[PDB]
Amino acid sequence: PKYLFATLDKAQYEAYCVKVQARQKKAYRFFHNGLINNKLFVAKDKAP
Amino acid sequence: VHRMVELMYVKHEKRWIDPSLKKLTGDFIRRVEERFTSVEGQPSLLQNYSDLDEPYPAVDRILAAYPEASTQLINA
């Protein structure tokens, strides 16, 4: 991965890193909810 | 843990709305400890609820002993 990031400016890469870490926090939340309530998989019922 | 203190301990009067609620805030703190320790032996940093009497000064001490407790959200 590092090698891809070396295409960017510290400007860009660091902007991305803030995005990522926010996602992880959502993810983390979801995963724990799922484990407990058996909803790691959620079937969609209707198209968008 | 912070919002707990914020909403149950009156700052400008240096008092808890009720000892019970100081216990509460204390117990949850104890929990966060547990969540973030993973070897037997280590004792609690909050050893007596007396510690929470002047809370905001002491609390930060404990919370800082368990770094990640400021990185990740509560377990479900």
Coordinates of N, CA and C in Angstrom, one line a residue:
Chain A
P1 N 0.8 -1.2 0.0 CA 0.0 0.0 0.0 C 0.8 1.3 0.0
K2 N 1.9 1.3 0.8 CA 2.6 2.6 0.9 C 3.0 3.1 -0.4
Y3 N 3.4 2.2 -1.3 CA 3.8 2.6 -2.7 C 2.7 3.3 -3.5
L4 N 1.5 3.0 -3.3 CA 0.4 3.7 -3.9 C 0.4 5.2 -3.4
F5 N 0.4 5.3 -2.0 CA 0.4 6.5 -1.4 C 1.5 7.5 -1.8
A6 N 2.6 6.9 -2.2 CA 3.8 7.7 -2.6 C 3.5 8.4 -4.0
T7 N 2.3 8.2 -4.5 CA 1.9 8.9 -5.7 C 1.4 10.3 -5.3
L8 N 0.9 10.4 -4.0 CA 0.2 11.6 -3.6 C 1.1 12.6 -2.9
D9 N 0.5 13.7 -2.6 CA 1.1 14.7 -1.7 C 0.7 14.4 -0.3
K10 N 1.6 14.6 0.7 CA 1.2 14.6 2.1 C -0.1 15.3 2.3
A11 N -0.3 16.3 1.5 CA -1.6 17.0 1.5 C -2.8 16.1 1.3
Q12 N -2.8 15.3 0.2 CA -3.8 14.4 -0.2 C -3.8 13.2 0.8
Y13 N -2.7 12.5 0.9 CA -2.7 11.3 1.7 C -3.2 11.5 3.1
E14 N -2.9 12.7 3.7 CA -3.3 13.0 5.1 C -4.8 13.3 5.2
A15 N -5.3 13.8 4.1 CA -6.8 14.1 4.0 C -7.5 12.8 4.0
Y16 N -7.0 11.8 3.2 CA -7.5 10.5 3.1 C -7.5 9.8 4.4
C17 N -6.4 9.9 5.1 CA -6.2 9.2 6.4 C -7.3 9.6 7.4
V18 N -7.8 10.8 7.3 CA -8.9 11.2 8.2 C -10.2 10.6 7.8
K19 N -10.4 10.5 6.5 CA -11.6 9.7 6.0 C -11.6 8.3 6.5
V20 N -10.5 7.6 6.3 CA -10.4 6.2 6.7 C -10.7 6.0 8.1
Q21 N -10.1 6.7 9.0 CA -10.2 6.5 10.5 C -11.7 6.8 10.9
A22 N -12.4 7.6 10.2 CA -13.8 7.8 10.5 C -14.6 6.6 10.1
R23 N -14.4 6.1 8.9 CA -15.0 4.8 8.5 C -14.8 3.7 9.5
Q24 N -13.6 3.5 9.9 CA -13.2 2.4 10.8 C -14.1 2.5 12.1
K25 N -14.4 3.8 12.5 CA -15.2 3.9 13.6 C -16.7 3.5 13.4
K26 N -17.2 3.8 12.2 CA -18.5 3.3 11.8 C -18.4 1.8 11.8
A27 N -17.4 1.2 11.1 CA -17.3 -0.2 10.9 C -17.3 -0.9 12.2
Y28 N -16.4 -0.4 13.1 CA -16.2 -1.0 14.5 C -17.6 -1.0 15.1
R29 N -18.4 0.1 15.0 CA -19.7 0.1 15.6 C -20.5 -1.0 15.1
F30 N -20.6 -1.1 13.8 CA -21.5 -2.0 13.1 C -21.1 -3.4 13.5
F31 N -19.9 -3.8 13.2 CA -19.4 -5.1 13.6 C -19.8 -5.6 15.0
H32 N -19.7 -4.7 16.0 CA -20.1 -5.1 17.4 C -21.6 -5.2 17.5
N33 N -22.3 -4.4 16.9 CA -23.7 -4.5 16.9 C -24.1 -5.8 16.3
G34 N -23.6 -6.1 15.1 CA -23.8 -7.3 14.4 C -23.6 -8.6 15.3
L35 N -22.4 -8.7 15.8 CA -22.0 -9.9 16.6 C -23.1 -10.2 17.7
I36 N -23.5 -9.1 18.3 CA -24.5 -9.2 19.4 C -25.9 -9.5 19.0
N37 N -26.3 -8.9 17.9 CA -27.7 -9.0 17.4 C -27.8 -9.8 16.1
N38 N -26.8 -10.5 15.8 CA -26.8 -11.3 14.6 C -27.2 -10.6 13.3
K39 N -26.7 -9.4 13.1 CA -27.0 -8.7 11.9 C -25.8 -8.3 11.2
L40 N -24.7 -9.1 11.1 CA -23.6 -8.8 10.3 C -23.9 -8.8 8.8
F41 N -25.0 -9.5 8.5 CA -25.6 -9.6 7.1 C -27.0 -9.0 7.1
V42 N -27.2 -8.1 6.3 CA -28.5 -7.5 6.2 C -29.0 -7.5 4.7
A43 N -30.0 -8.4 4.5 CA -30.6 -8.5 3.2 C -31.3 -7.2 2.9
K44 N -31.1 -6.8 1.6 CA -31.9 -5.7 1.1 C -33.2 -6.2 0.6
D45 N -34.2 -5.4 0.8 CA -35.6 -5.8 0.4 C -36.1 -5.1 -0.9
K46 N -35.5 -3.9 -1.1 CA -35.9 -3.1 -2.3 C -34.7 -2.5 -2.9
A47 N -34.7 -2.3 -4.2 CA -33.6 -1.6 -4.9 C -33.6 -0.1 -4.4
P48 N -32.6 0.6 -4.7 CA -32.5 2.0 -4.3 C -33.5 2.9 -5.0
Chain B
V1 N -17.4 8.5 30.0 CA -17.0 8.7 31.4 C -17.0 10.2 31.7
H2 N -16.5 11.0 30.7 CA -16.5 12.5 30.9 C -17.9 13.0 30.9
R3 N -18.8 12.7 30.0 CA -20.2 13.2 29.9 C -20.9 12.8 31.2
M4 N -20.5 11.7 31.8 CA -21.1 11.2 33.0 C -20.8 12.2 34.1
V5 N -19.6 12.5 34.3 CA -19.1 13.5 35.3 C -19.8 14.9 35.0
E6 N -19.7 15.3 33.7 CA -20.3 16.6 33.3 C -21.7 16.8 33.8
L7 N -22.5 15.7 33.7 CA -24.0 15.8 33.9 C -24.5 15.4 35.3
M8 N -23.6 14.9 36.1 CA -24.0 14.5 37.5 C -23.2 15.2 38.6
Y9 N -22.0 15.7 38.2 CA -21.2 16.5 39.2 C -21.3 18.0 38.9
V10 N -21.8 18.8 39.8 CA -22.0 20.2 39.6 C -20.6 20.9 39.8
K11 N -20.0 21.4 38.7 CA -18.7 22.0 38.8 C -18.5 23.1 39.8
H12 N -19.3 24.2 39.6 CA -19.1 25.4 40.4 C -19.6 25.2 41.9
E13 N -20.0 24.0 42.3 CA -20.3 23.7 43.6 C -19.6 22.6 44.2
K14 N -18.7 22.0 43.4 CA -17.9 20.8 43.8 C -18.6 19.8 44.6
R15 N -19.8 19.3 44.0 CA -20.6 18.3 44.6 C -21.3 17.4 43.5
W16 N -21.5 16.2 43.9 CA -22.3 15.3 43.1 C -23.8 15.4 43.5
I17 N -24.6 15.4 42.5 CA -26.1 15.5 42.7 C -26.5 14.4 43.7
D18 N -25.7 13.3 43.8 CA -26.0 12.3 44.7 C -24.9 11.3 44.7
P19 N -24.4 10.8 45.9 CA -23.4 9.9 46.0 C -23.6 8.6 45.1
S20 N -24.8 8.1 45.1 CA -25.1 7.0 44.2 C -24.6 7.2 42.8
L21 N -24.9 8.4 42.2 CA -24.5 8.7 40.9 C -23.0 8.9 40.7
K22 N -22.3 9.2 41.8 CA -20.8 9.2 41.8 C -20.4 7.7 41.7
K23 N -21.1 6.9 42.4 CA -20.8 5.4 42.4 C -20.9 5.0 41.0
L24 N -22.1 5.2 40.4 CA -22.4 4.9 39.0 C -21.2 5.3 38.1
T25 N -21.0 6.6 38.0 CA -19.8 7.0 37.2 C -18.5 6.3 37.5
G26 N -18.4 6.0 38.8 CA -17.2 5.2 39.2 C -17.2 3.8 38.7
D27 N -18.3 3.2 38.8 CA -18.4 1.8 38.3 C -18.1 1.6 36.8
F28 N -18.7 2.5 36.0 CA -18.5 2.5 34.6 C -17.0 2.7 34.3
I29 N -16.4 3.6 35.0 CA -15.0 3.9 34.9 C -14.2 2.5 35.1
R30 N -14.6 1.9 36.2 CA -14.0 0.6 36.5 C -14.1 -0.4 35.3
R31 N -15.2 -0.3 34.6 CA -15.5 -1.1 33.5 C -14.5 -0.8 32.4
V32 N -14.4 0.5 32.0 CA -13.5 0.9 31.0 C -12.2 0.3 31.2
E33 N -11.7 0.4 32.5 CA -10.5 -0.2 32.9 C -10.5 -1.7 32.4
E34 N -11.4 -2.5 32.8 CA -11.5 -3.9 32.5 C -11.5 -4.1 31.0
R35 N -12.3 -3.3 30.2 CA -12.3 -3.5 28.8 C -10.9 -3.4 28.2
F36 N -10.1 -2.5 28.8 CA -8.8 -2.2 28.2 C -7.6 -2.8 28.9
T37 N -7.9 -3.7 29.9 CA -6.8 -4.4 30.5 C -6.9 -5.9 30.0
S38 N -5.8 -6.6 29.8 CA -5.9 -7.9 29.3 C -4.9 -8.9 29.9
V39 N -4.5 -8.5 31.2 CA -3.7 -9.5 32.0 C -4.1 -9.4 33.4
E40 N -4.2 -10.5 34.1 CA -4.5 -10.5 35.5 C -3.4 -10.0 36.4
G41 N -3.8 -9.3 37.5 CA -2.8 -8.8 38.4 C -2.9 -7.3 38.6
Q42 N -3.0 -6.5 37.5 CA -3.1 -5.1 37.6 C -4.3 -4.7 38.4
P43 N -4.1 -3.9 39.4 CA -5.2 -3.4 40.2 C -5.9 -2.1 39.6
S44 N -7.0 -1.7 40.2 CA -7.8 -0.6 39.7 C -7.1 0.7 40.1
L45 N -7.1 1.7 39.2 CA -6.6 3.0 39.4 C -7.5 3.8 40.3
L46 N -8.8 3.5 40.1 CA -9.9 4.0 41.0 C -10.1 2.9 42.0
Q47 N -9.4 3.0 43.1 CA -9.5 2.0 44.2 C -10.5 2.3 45.2
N48 N -10.8 3.6 45.5 CA -11.9 4.0 46.3 C -12.7 5.1 45.7
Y49 N -14.0 5.0 45.7 CA -14.9 6.0 45.1 C -14.7 7.3 45.7
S50 N -14.0 7.4 46.8 CA -13.6 8.6 47.4 C -12.8 9.5 46.4
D51 N -12.1 8.8 45.6 CA -11.3 9.4 44.5 C -12.1 10.4 43.7
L52 N -13.3 10.0 43.4 CA -14.2 10.8 42.5 C -14.7 12.1 43.2
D53 N -14.4 12.3 44.4 CA -14.9 13.4 45.2 C -14.6 14.7 44.5
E54 N -13.3 14.9 44.2 CA -12.9 15.9 43.2 C -12.4 15.2 42.0
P55 N -13.4 15.0 41.1 CA -13.4 14.0 40.0 C -12.5 14.4 38.8
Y56 N -12.9 15.5 38.1 CA -12.3 15.9 36.9 C -10.8 15.9 37.0
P57 N -10.2 16.4 38.1 CA -8.8 16.3 38.3 C -8.2 14.9 38.3
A58 N -8.9 13.9 38.9 CA -8.4 12.5 39.1 C -8.8 11.7 37.9
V59 N -10.0 11.8 37.4 CA -10.5 11.0 36.3 C -9.5 10.9 35.2
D60 N -9.1 12.1 34.7 CA -8.2 12.2 33.6 C -6.9 11.3 33.8
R61 N -6.5 11.2 35.0 CA -5.4 10.3 35.4 C -5.7 8.9 34.9
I62 N -6.8 8.3 35.4 CA -7.2 7.0 35.1 C -7.3 6.8 33.6
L63 N -8.2 7.6 33.0 CA -8.5 7.5 31.6 C -7.2 7.6 30.7
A64 N -6.2 8.2 31.2 CA -4.9 8.4 30.5 C -4.1 7.1 30.6
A65 N -4.3 6.4 31.7 CA -3.6 5.1 31.9 C -4.0 4.1 30.9
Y66 N -5.2 4.2 30.4 CA -5.8 3.3 29.4 C -6.0 4.1 28.1
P67 N -5.0 4.4 27.3 CA -4.9 5.3 26.2 C -6.1 5.1 25.2
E68 N -6.2 3.9 24.7 CA -7.2 3.6 23.6 C -8.6 4.0 24.0
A69 N -8.9 4.1 25.3 CA -10.2 4.5 25.8 C -10.6 5.9 25.3
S70 N -9.8 6.5 24.4 CA -10.0 7.8 23.8 C -10.0 7.7 22.3
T71 N -9.7 6.5 21.8 CA -9.6 6.2 20.4 C -10.8 5.5 19.8
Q72 N -11.4 4.5 20.6 CA -12.5 3.7 20.1 C -13.8 3.8 20.9
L73 N -14.9 3.6 20.3 CA -16.2 3.9 20.9 C -16.6 2.7 21.8
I74 N -17.7 2.8 22.6 CA -18.1 1.8 23.4 C -18.4 0.5 22.6
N75 N -18.1 -0.7 23.2 CA -18.5 -1.9 22.7 C -20.0 -1.9 22.7
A76 N -20.6 -2.6 21.7 CA -22.1 -2.7 21.7 C -22.4 -3.3 23.0

